[PDB]
Design a protein around this ligand. Structure first.
Ligand code: ADP
Ligand code: MG
Ligand code: MG
Ligand code: MG
Length: 1281
């Protein structure tokens, strides 16, 4: 009542292979199911009626997706929808499109999947088993009628505040509320609340208690990290935090901000910061320092319960940290980490794996690594930051460690998300908060998320994107940046972030509950104030900047509300206009009143640990097992799921070389689109070492970070800055003393001796899982797990080395920082034979580690290196194998000098690595290494050689010999199997099988023109700069680098949001060129690019503006990725486009981020003039790029008209539909088409991301500044005259 639900049937929902996985899942559980069929169905909750025309508009918005075989329903209906009381992100984004298409009648759109199942035996018991399989019990519910969906839209009345009756019952009322509300309060904290409230003479409200309990938890007060310690009977002088701070006291160098914000900041470089001016809308370079922020976060517990949103909001919360650094900043690139228990992939179990069971309430390791990476990548992709480095460890074994024989592993996973961003010098310091400052929530209408449903998070990355654009508009105003103060909303929701915001400014605040934006009107005041809804920030802004701030938000379509005022009195007030009362009324010192410090009085446990039993170990069997341990094995399933080219500033991504092998040891970005200065990121971690030796695990993490970053041009080691993220089972015998010792080992010792700061860190301190298996208690406990992320300013992005071997005359030299210790404890080798072993690796000599770093820096600067790969998991064996994989070559090595224990020489995980040098440079490089005190560690191994032979000799004996292709295919099998069970198995198999064909020549180039002839230069030289409209919808993310590419070609790039067109601020009549940029407009909901296009079509004024533009005789338009999608959906407005295809879900059913080989084909395209017959790699980054025609008649007609402009080719140079050479399954390799007149071109790949040579993942050595793709932008300039 007050609202009607309309049901609108959508398109078929599951491809054939997905239907076959279902049918087969049913046959495997003995459910005789003749057939299954699925159809999306949509639900529109309307506040007013739709006329015949709006009805048709709504119907048309809800036609999208691949044109799959439609069937008429039969059998039993099971409809799967979100759980009632829940609103999906699909709903947020779809309803938004509805509103921007003028359908204000729509209150909410929601979507379900209708399953039509013919089975016909099946007891009601078995139907519950069918129902179970079709849905996720943590997010969804199953219904029997389409009608039942009305349950999703029930309007609820605001629930009132509840007082806890301390006055009337005494202390028992606090104890009862402590249990009922789950406050987890300690006795001394119940004491405090009793005293504080007895003094005020009134009962506490529920909200006030909940706020207090959120603020005084472990994760939030960091009680363990500030604790005093007593260890083996001796009081210790320093807390853990103090020992971390010791690194900043010792090395403050280059540090701009540390421990005073939710990211750290270091000095960057002076470069062209590129953005649109507030007054002109023109993009310009602003020559100024771009300083570098860094942060790394975890999101471990949620990910155990619901991994997709758990990982996604892991990234999302950390991106908010970055944006809310100082007075606003811009995230640039990200990193991702997973640690989980054994994967045990069905049909692919490995000999070290044993099922130990798990709690019913958590998902398996395999579920985490299936859905979690897709979740992390969904936020990074739809937000728009490249994910360029990461780690993925598996560990689960019964082991004789510090507390005797017990199960150690990661049933509670590590889910790690971090990254770097840029910030202006003047915004690094947070400002003062003036009295009467407006206090604002920027971002999403809130719901009851986080209050085991309360650990199920929810991500809407496009909402966050819209918020970032506002934040960007604010810092881009320089001295006029209206942001006085900004902070992210995370744990505790507003009940933490608003008090933290006023409190860091020395203020109080008065707030109004009913000013806060909400999508559940039923929520209690406690739910409104304490819920952990996502994509929110809190800021302060002066009252007189509010009109400005409103103009900025409205142009971005970023929702915001003013919810209160900052006060001089240090009081916290929260009024409720609906119930005319005051849920919160407290002094801030009472809320933020602290109880005493914690003292931990603890004892050292140290494991004895036994020698590696080698009975079943051969070097050959060990090579095979080690390459099948997911920690070692190829990571493609984690890398290609995320964009790696967004921004146009990525110099080094995971994938290396012509054969695009994911082994890059660190990530590198350019600082700007006009510099070779940059930033670098690397990770070091070695948790299983902590099962033998806590200090050594931490030291090795520091050292690996350094070895992974070392072939990058940095200089001074003091440029390198660390995040230290600590994961422990605090309280588990031996760990606490372990934690203190490991923090000491890096904070007090190693990092200060090296000159390394740790200005940021986090901790997560209950890394264990307890459950009942038989009548038995069971425990899985993590090792102490330090993850070090290293971050650095880069002097020259171009000088970076990769593991890609050259086959020119060369020498392979090992730098064995293990000094022949050759430890085998807690290695991959031991793990893969179910053992812990004796003695682990460690940092053997700090001077020599420093010496290594400085020596690598001298060799990099002087260009003496052809390649570098450090030694980590899997030892020298893996290092050499991976270099041979990346170089598509052989290796001939001798290990006689590495000791008689050949297994230990190859498989120790001591620090160091293999450099490759030119043969003629060998002597000079050995002399240089000797000057840094290293002669003793440096060992000539042999050479890289053309071919397929991987050979390891010792004197006259062959220690190990195998085909390099055979090793490379074994190392691939983990990612193959993961892709097989997650993606379309046909694609997974084609990708895998192409690795086995050694003749694959890899990416290679043929150019039909001179890539250095700047054909636009005569035009640029006149000083006349035509405008191009760089068109962007909400969710677009590639506009900045697109602008920069047109800029290099001599245009004035103007920023045109769709809101500028809708509001009449820009007219396309003033432009001769237009480009629709890439991204995830509306998060691709209702089809990639559809919302964007249909919002143009359904507005008749704007529709007419586009049509007029395209119907002019000389205008040019380009659509790229999302933009191509958009323009393919606007096709009725574009002359000569009648044969154009649609673009739909990739055949792989996976987001594909590839460096793909294409060829330019003959077509009218004016943007491709001079390039025809050229073949070169381009950045590709999409999930809905598959060309779909309506039938073969459409395809032939398209082809015979000569309108295809780009095709995917394999590395042999033939047009292909084989994956991933053709990443999406497009017929005849098609990824670009033009119009009959050549004036409009649309393409899925991103030329604007790779117009700079430095930003191509692989490129030929001889190229200059400009890639081949720079010709497009220049062709645009020349054509305009
Ligand atoms: N979880 C992940 N997400 C994204 N990239 C990852 C992930 N795990 C590993 N990678 C990338 O895969 C490559 C190989 O990883 P790994 O063998 O763990 O690195 P290393 O041994 O050099 O520390 C690297 O380029 C790394 O950055
Ligand atoms: Mg590795
Ligand atoms: Mg490495
Ligand atoms: Mg590593």
């Amino acid at each position: 009542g007050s609202h009607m639900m309309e049901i609108l049937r959508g398109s078929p929902a599951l491809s054939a292979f997905r239907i076959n996985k279902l049918l087969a899942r049913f046959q495997a559980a003995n459910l005789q199911v003749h057939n299954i069929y699925a159809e999306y169905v949509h639900f529109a909750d309307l506040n007013a009626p739709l006329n015949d025309s709006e009805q048709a508009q709504l119907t048309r918005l809800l036609q999208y997706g691949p044109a799959l075989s439609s069937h008429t329903p039969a059998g039993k209906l099971l409809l799967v929808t979100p759980r009632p009381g829940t609103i999906s992100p699909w709903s947020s984004k779809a309803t938004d499109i509805a509103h921007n298409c003028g359908l204000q009648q729509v209150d909410r759109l929601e979507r379900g999947v209708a399953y039509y199942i013919e089975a016909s035996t099946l007891t009601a018991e078995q139907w519950r088993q069918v129902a179970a399989e079709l849905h996720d019990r943590m997010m969804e519910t199953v219904f029997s009628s389409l009608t039942d969906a009305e349950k999703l839209f029930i309007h609820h009345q605001p629930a009132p505040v509840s007082s806890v009756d301390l006055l009337g019952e005494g202390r028992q009322a606090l104890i009862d509320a402590n249990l009922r509300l789950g406050l987890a309060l300690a006795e001394d904290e119940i004491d405090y609340l009793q005293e504080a409230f007895t003094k005020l003479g009134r009962n506490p409200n529920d909200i006030e208690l909940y706020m207090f309990a959120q603020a005084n938890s472990e994760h939030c007060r960091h009680k363990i990290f500030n604790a005093d310690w007593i260890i083996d009977g001796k009081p210790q002088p320093k807390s853990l935090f103090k020992m971390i701070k010791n690194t900043f006291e010792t090395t403050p160098d280059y540090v701009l901000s540390a421990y005073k914000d939710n990211a750290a900041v270091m000095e960057g470089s002076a470069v062209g910061r590129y953005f649109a001016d507030h007054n002109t809308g023109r993009y310009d370079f602003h020559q100024e320092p771009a300083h570098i922020l860094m942060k790394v976060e975890t999101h471990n517990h949620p990910t155990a319960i619901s991994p997709w949103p758990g990982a996604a909001t892991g990234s999302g919360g950390e991106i908010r940290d970055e944006g809310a650094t100082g007075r606003g900043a811009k995230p640039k690139a990200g990193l991702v980490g997973f640690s989980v228990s054994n994967l045990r992939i069905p049909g692919f179990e490995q000999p070290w794996e044993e099922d130990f069971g798990k709690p019913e309430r958590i998902v398996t390791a395999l579920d985490i690594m299936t859905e979690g990476p897709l979740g992390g990548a969904a936020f990074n992709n739809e937000f728009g930051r490249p994910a360029l480095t990461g780690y993925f460890r598996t560990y689960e074994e019964k082991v004789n460690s510090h507390n005797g024989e017990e199960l150690r592993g990661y049933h509670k996973p590590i889910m790690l998300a971090g990254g770097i961003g840029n910030i202006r010098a003047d915004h690094v310091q947070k400002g003062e908060i003036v009295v009467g400052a407006k206090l604002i929530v920027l971002g999403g209408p809130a719901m009851n998320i986080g209050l085991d449903f309360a650990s199920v998070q929810r991500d809407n990355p496009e909402m966050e994107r819209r918020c970032q654009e506002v934040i960007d508009r604010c810092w881009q105003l320089g001295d006029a940046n209206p942001i006085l103060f900004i902070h992210d909303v995370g744990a505790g929701g507003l009940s933490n972030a608003m008090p933290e915001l006023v409190s860091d400014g020395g203020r109080g605040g008065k707030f109004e509950l009913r000013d806060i934006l909400s999508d559940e009107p039923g929520m209690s005041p406690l739910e409104i104030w304490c819920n952990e809804s996502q994509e929110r920030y809190v800021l302060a802004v002066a009252a007189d900047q509010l009109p400005l701030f409103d103009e900025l938000c409205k142009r971005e379509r970023a929702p915001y509300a003013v919810i209160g005022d900052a006060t001089e009195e240090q009081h916290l007030s929260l009024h409720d206009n609906h119930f005319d009362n005051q849920p919160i009324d407290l002094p801030l010192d009472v809320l933020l009143g602290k109880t005493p410090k914690m003292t931990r009085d603890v004892q050292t446990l140290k494991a004895k640990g036994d020698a590696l039993n080698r009975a079943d170990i051969t070097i050959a069997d060990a090579v095979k097992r080690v390459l099948h341990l997911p920690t070692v094995a190829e990571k493609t399933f984690l890398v290609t799921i995320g964009a790696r080219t967004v921004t146009g500033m990525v110099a080094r991504d995971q994938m290396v070389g012509p054969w695009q092998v994911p082994v890059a040891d660190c990530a590198v970005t350019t600082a700007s689109l006009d510099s070779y200065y940059g930033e670098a990121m690397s990770i070091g971690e070695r948790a299983p070492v902590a099962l033998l030796d806590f200090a050594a695990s931490a030291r090795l993490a520091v050292g690996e970070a350094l070895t992974n970053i070392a072939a990058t041009q940095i200089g001074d080691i003091k440029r390198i800055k660390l995040s230290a993220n600590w994961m422990a089972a605090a309280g588990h015998p031996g760990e606490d003393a372990g934690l203190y010792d490991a923090v000491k080992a890096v904070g007090e010792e190693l990092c200060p001796q090296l000159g390394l700061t740790i200005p940021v860190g986090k901790d997560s301190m209950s890394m264990k899982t307890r459950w009942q298996e038989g009548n038995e208690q069971r425990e899985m406990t993590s090792p102490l797990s330090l993850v070090i992320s290293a971050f650095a300013r880069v002097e020259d992005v171009r000088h970076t080395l990769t593991p890609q071997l050259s086959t020119e005359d060369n020498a392979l030299l090992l730098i064995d920082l293990g000094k022949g210790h050759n430890a085998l404890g807690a290695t991959a080798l031991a793990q893969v034979y179910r053992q812990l072993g004796d003695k682990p690796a460690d940092v053997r000599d700090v001077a020599q580690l420093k010496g290594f770093y400085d020596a690598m820096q001298a060799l990099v600067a002087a260009r003496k290196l052809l390649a570098w790969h450090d030694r980590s998991d899997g030892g020298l064996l893996v290092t050499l194998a991976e270099m041979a994989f990346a170089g598509h070559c052989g290796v001939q090595v001798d290990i006689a000098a590495l000791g008689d224990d050949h297994l230990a020489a190859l498989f120790n995980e001591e620090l160091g690595g293999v450099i490759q040098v030119r043969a003629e440079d060998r002597d000079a490089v050995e002399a240089l290494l000797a000057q840094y005190g290293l002669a003793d560690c440096v060992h000539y191994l042999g050479q890289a050689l053309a071919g397929d032979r991987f050979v390891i000799t010792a004197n006259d004996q062959t220690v190990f010999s195998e085909s390099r292709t055979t090793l490379r295919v074994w190392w691939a099998e983990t990612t193959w199997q993961m892709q097989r069970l997650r993606d379309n198995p046909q694609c997974a198999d084609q990708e895998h099988e192409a690795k086995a064909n050694d003749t694959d020549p890899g990416l290679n180039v043929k150019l039909s023109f001179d890539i250095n002839e700047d054909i636009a230069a005569p035009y640029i030289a006149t000083g006349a700069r035509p405008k191009v409209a760089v068109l962007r919808e909400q969710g677009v993310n590639s506009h900045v680098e697109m602008a920069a590419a047109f800029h290099r070609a001599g245009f004035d790039a103007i920023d045109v949001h769709m809101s500028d067109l809708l509001g009449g601020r820009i007219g396309l009549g003033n432009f001769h060129a237009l480009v629709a940029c890439g991204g995830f407009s509306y998060g691709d909901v209702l089809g990639a690019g559809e919302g964007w296009a249909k919002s143009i079509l359904f507005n008749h004024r704007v529709r007419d503006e586009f049509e007029t533009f395209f119907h002019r005789p000389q205008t040019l338009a380009l659509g790229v990725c999302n933009g191509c999608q958009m323009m393919s959906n606007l096709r009725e407005l574009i002359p000569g486009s009648e044969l154009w295809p649609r673009f739909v879900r990739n055949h792989s059913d996976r987001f594909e981020a590839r460096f793909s080989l294409v060829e330019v084909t003959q077509s009218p395209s004016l943007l491709l003039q001079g390039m025809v017959g050229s073949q070169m790699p381009i950045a590709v980054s999409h999930g809905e790029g598959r060309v779909e025609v309506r039938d073969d008649a459409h395809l032939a007609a398209l082809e015979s008209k000569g309108l295809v402009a780009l095709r995917y080719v394999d590395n042999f140079g033939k047009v292909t539909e084989t994956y991933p050479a053709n990443p999406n399954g497009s017929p005849n390799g098609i990824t670009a088409v033009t119009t009959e007149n050549g004036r409009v071109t649309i393409m899925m790949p991103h030329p604007e991301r790779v117009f700079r040579t430095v930003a191509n993942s692989w490129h030929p050595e001889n190229w200059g500044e400009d890639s081949p793709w720079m010709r497009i932008f220049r062709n645009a300039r020349k054509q305009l005259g």
